[PDB]
Amino acid sequence: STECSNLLLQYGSFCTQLKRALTGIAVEQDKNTQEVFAQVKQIYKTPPI
Amino acid sequence: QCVNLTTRTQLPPAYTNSFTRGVYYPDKVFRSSVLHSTQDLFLPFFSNVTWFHVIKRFDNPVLPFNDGVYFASIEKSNIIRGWIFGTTLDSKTQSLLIVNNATNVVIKVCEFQFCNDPFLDMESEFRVYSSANNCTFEYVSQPFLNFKNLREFVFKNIDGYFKIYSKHTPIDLPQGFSALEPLVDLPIGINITRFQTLLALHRSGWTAGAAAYYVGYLQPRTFLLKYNENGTITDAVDCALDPLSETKCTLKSFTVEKGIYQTSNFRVQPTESIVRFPNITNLCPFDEVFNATRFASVYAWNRKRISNCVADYSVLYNLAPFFTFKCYGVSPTKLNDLCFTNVYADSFVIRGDEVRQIAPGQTGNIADYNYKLPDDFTGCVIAWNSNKLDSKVSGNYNYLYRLFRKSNLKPFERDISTEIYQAGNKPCNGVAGFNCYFPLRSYSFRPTYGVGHQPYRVVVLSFELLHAPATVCGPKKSTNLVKNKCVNFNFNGLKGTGVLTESNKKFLPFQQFGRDIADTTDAVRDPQTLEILDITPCSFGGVSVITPGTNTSNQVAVLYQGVNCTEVNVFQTRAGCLIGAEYVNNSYECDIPIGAGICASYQSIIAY
Amino acid sequence: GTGVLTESNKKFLPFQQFGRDIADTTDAVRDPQTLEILDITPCSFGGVSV
Amino acid sequence: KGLTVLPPLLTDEMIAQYTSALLAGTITSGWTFGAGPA
Amino acid sequence: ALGKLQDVVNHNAQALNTLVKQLSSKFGAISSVLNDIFSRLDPPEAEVQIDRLITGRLQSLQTYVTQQLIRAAEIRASANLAATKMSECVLGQSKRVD
Amino acid sequence: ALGKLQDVVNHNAQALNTLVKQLSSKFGAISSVLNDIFSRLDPPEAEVQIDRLITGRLQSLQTYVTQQLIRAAEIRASANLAATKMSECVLGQSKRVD
Amino acid sequence: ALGKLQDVVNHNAQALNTLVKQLSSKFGAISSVLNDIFSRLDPPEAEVQ
Ligand SMILES: *[C@@H]1O[C@H](CO)[C@@H](O[C@@H]2O[C@H](CO)[C@@H](O)[C@H](O)[C@H]2NC(C)=O)[C@H](O)[C@H]1NC(C)=O
Ligand SMILES: *[C@@H]1O[C@H](CO)[C@@H](O)[C@H](O)[C@H]1NC(C)=O
Ligand SMILES: *[C@@H]1O[C@H](CO)[C@@H](O)[C@H](O)[C@H]1NC(C)=O
Ligand SMILES: *[C@@H]1O[C@H](CO)[C@@H](O)[C@H](O)[C@H]1NC(C)=O
Ligand SMILES: *[C@@H]1O[C@H](CO)[C@@H](O)[C@H](O)[C@H]1NC(C)=O
Ligand SMILES: *[C@@H]1O[C@H](CO)[C@@H](O)[C@H](O)[C@H]1NC(C)=O
Ligand SMILES: *[C@@H]1O[C@H](CO)[C@@H](O)[C@H](O)[C@H]1NC(C)=O
Ligand SMILES: *[C@@H]1O[C@H](CO)[C@@H](O)[C@H](O)[C@H]1NC(C)=O
Ligand SMILES: *[C@@H]1O[C@H](CO)[C@@H](O)[C@H](O)[C@H]1NC(C)=O
């Protein structure tokens, strides 16, 4: 509904707040994975034997 | 007086770039050192603005006003003097005239008989209009006015208010920024759809002085305005021009740091509206219910089923004899646009003061013991005076009401039982006597009584909303069905925007439409053809603008999240389709994270 | 409204009547009789802790 | 209906590659790789 | 054995399913479908009904974001613990008991 | 280099700024200014309009307080970590890797 | 000495007490009691209250 979006614009920055909080969570998950697994800057490999 | 000019040289009108012009102050509010977002009628940045010249060139066409007009004038010696606004530009309608002659600025609202070629011509010759009959408004104001002058004007006609914004600049169009100050707020309250500018000739036939003007059209959009310490608008951002400015508008800043920013959601818009209604058309017998000579009494109110007809309710609203046409669960004006089933007309006659009691949730005598409406009632109550038909000078006693009953009735319940009532401790045993009264008493309808007691005929139309296959519909015509395209459809009063596709869902014969987990309709059975169409919402996704700092570069790339590249430097990622970045097989450290192992950087913008 | 009216250093343009601050609240007004600009600082607000 | 799941920045194979690098460091070098050169 | 990760997946999927399910709530309006509200009422009362739906759905969405932030804090604490274990148990030998 | 503190300052200032910006939201009323409601409408409808503004602003304020509580939990966890680093890295030598 | 546990008990009890006291809030309605709304108003407006 276009008219619902027009009426939704009257409520201000609620949508921006929710998107910003979700974006913060989304970048936080990637930061968590970097902190746990990306603790070495060298990719070591095992010997073939 | 009118004069035809037949010495023109044929040339098509030119087009050029608007750059960052056409900005005006949205309101009369001072703001200092802030960024403010406005959704107003604005001119887009770098838009296609029409260019006209006056040099033998004499450009005076008549252009549509649309929703707003930006007029730019690269002017010397003040050839351009005014404008004409209206709809038909004759005495049939009312027109607005803006002129600035050699002495003073005149604003008039009259029914001018305009010339086909109106123009101006020491200046002692005025041939603009031949007559002005009905003048409703006059306003006299201050003088508004190598090429030396840039005159920028914005005309808007919103809510019958005509706003003129103006700016003068000492100078194709120059590239720069200049905010237009509001000049005239005009209370006209008339329709304007077409305009024409007024030029001035030079006579020595005639010669045209060197001038150039530009016409642009306003569209509803949002701008991000920057206000300095002195309250003067110095910069603006068009939020819908390019993804970089969209990012600037979203972050509410003119400088964007390096990173990926979620800005908006791309969604494909519908192309055409398809209405599907049942093909069957039978004139609905509203004449039988509403024009009948005799109605039933309120205790024995008549219920008529209405089904398998197309109903035109517009003939009921436009007629003036009915005092009350009051609807509760549906709008009166939308009845022609909807489809219904479970339609019932309940006809009875009541008093003048009792018409308030034919409503949900009312406390009263006929509400409790004659006709009860449910709390969730949808439909319309119709009441009109029937003193001319349902009254007699000797007393019309044919209409009876249940004065006494042991308990209140249920909704849509009729009681016609002529049993005696026990009003006291003593049982009555079916015989009248002390504290034993008949429940049904007749109204003493006479024409001599005042309003409030005169007989009123009330018809209650009861409907149900969309929860069954509909048999009663409005006069809207059925359109053809289109497959695999985004359309805004109306199926039996159900409006939606989606793509209609073939389906493999084995609907049972009773089943008409289908509902998903969220309960929004996902499939529907089309009338006339009885086929089952699947409804899928139109393509949409999140737009992320990958950009480095604005200090470094203005190049951007866009990521359409969860969207394959064939439904929108093109690279397909698991995260979505990336436009504007070139995939490089080399591996670098992650600079701007895209997702699914893909990162972006600036070196052009590369993705790796 | 209710507020302290002080003389303003703001240079309102001729069309401009009232002014909004950083947060879009009415911080300046032009008097309808004498065309001068006045800031409207709100009356002092404090948190009373015991 | 407006809900989307964004993919993680590190895919499963790259996370597995990081675990492989950590395993190779802790097997071939002990704790030396965590405090400096392996 | 793998209940913790499956539990996290279940909470995220269940929160999304609940958020989708909340669209089927009238929220004190005549219908849960916005298009019906437009197709049935005049703008003075349709505006009120659309408002009822918008405030209900917005409350649902803010509730979902609030539990997402609380779960994000819990998962961030668990990830900080996992990073500490990776640094101290995998990249070194720990004298910390248990 | 100092992004973490700058982020804390930016999130607190941005939350405060958004909270004041929410006062300029009509929330589905005729105006965002209470005085306009008193001057433009009779009390039977004025009570409804002020009720709408009060519920919208109260919901905004509750959202802000909830965000502050979640951020306070995050900062408390970071401060507990900082106190642990102050005790174990500054006031002693730590055998804990990284 | 035992302030931290007493604080936890106080916050839980105070939160419960506040949740109880919120039932005596009209929230804009004519009364905080549902029965009074059913008896004092018609169902079209009682539903709203
Ligand atoms: C200038 O030219 C225009 C266009 O040819 C003339 O307008 C027409 O005049 C004829 C006169 O018989 C009318 O029948 C038409 O209806 C007019 N057309 C329109 C669109 O108005 C105009 O009259 C000419 N000017 C003069 C002074 O003759
Ligand atoms: C402007 O419009 C003309 C035709 O109306 C077109 O030929 C021209 O390419 C357009 N200019 C731009 C920049 O799109
Ligand atoms: C204004 O006039 C145009 C045609 O000149 C017409 O299509 C439009 O409906 C009119 N608008 C109003 C509001 O009268
Ligand atoms: C300019 O127009 C006004 C309004 O018709 C008129 O009174 C005035 O005399 C005009 N000026 C000249 C020089 O004719
Ligand atoms: C407009 O003018 C015509 C002729 O001059 C006249 O008959 C008509 O009554 C006028 N209408 C109005 C509304 O002034
Ligand atoms: C603002 O005005 C002051 C004087 O009123 C002037 O010195 C200053 O340069 C102006 N700033 C801008 C950006 O115009
Ligand atoms: C309504 O009824 C009157 C007589 O009762 C009749 O003359 C008239 O034609 C009827 N009109 C319609 C539309 O049926
Ligand atoms: C009209 O609709 C009916 C079902 O309502 C269907 O049986 C019939 O075939 C349709 N006729 C046409 C010409 O579409
Ligand atoms: C009256 O008001 C005008 C502007 O509205 C102003 O210029 C003038 O000084 C005022 N006169 C007095 C006596 O206040």
Author numbering:
A (entry chain A): 746 to 794
B (entry chain C): 14 to 68, 77 to 142, 153 to 176, 185 to 210, 215 to 247, 257 to 620, 641 to 675, 691 to 695
C (entry chain B): 548 to 597
D (entry chain A): 856 to 893
E (entry chain A), F (entry chain C): 944 to 1041
G (entry chain B): 944 to 992
Authors' account:
SARS-CoV-2 relies on a trimeric spike protein for host cell entry via recognition of the angiotensin-converting enzyme 2 (ACE2) receptor. The spike protein comprises two domains: the S1 domain, which contains the receptor binding domain (RBD), and the S2 domain, which is responsible for membrane fusion. The RBD mediates attachment to human cells through the ACE2 receptor and is the primary target of neutralizing antibodies.
(B) Cryo-EM map of the Omicron spike protein at 2.79-Å resolution. The mutations in the Omicron variant spike protein are distributed both on the surface and the interior of the spike protein, including the NTD and RBD regions. The mutations in the RBD are predominantly distributed on one face of the domain, which spans regions that bind ACE2 as well as those that form epitopes for numerous neutralizing antibodies. (C) Cryo-EM structure of Omicron spike protein indicating the locations of modeled mutations on one protomer. (D) The Omicron spike protein RBD shown in two orthogonal orientations with Cα positions of the mutated residues shown as red spheres.
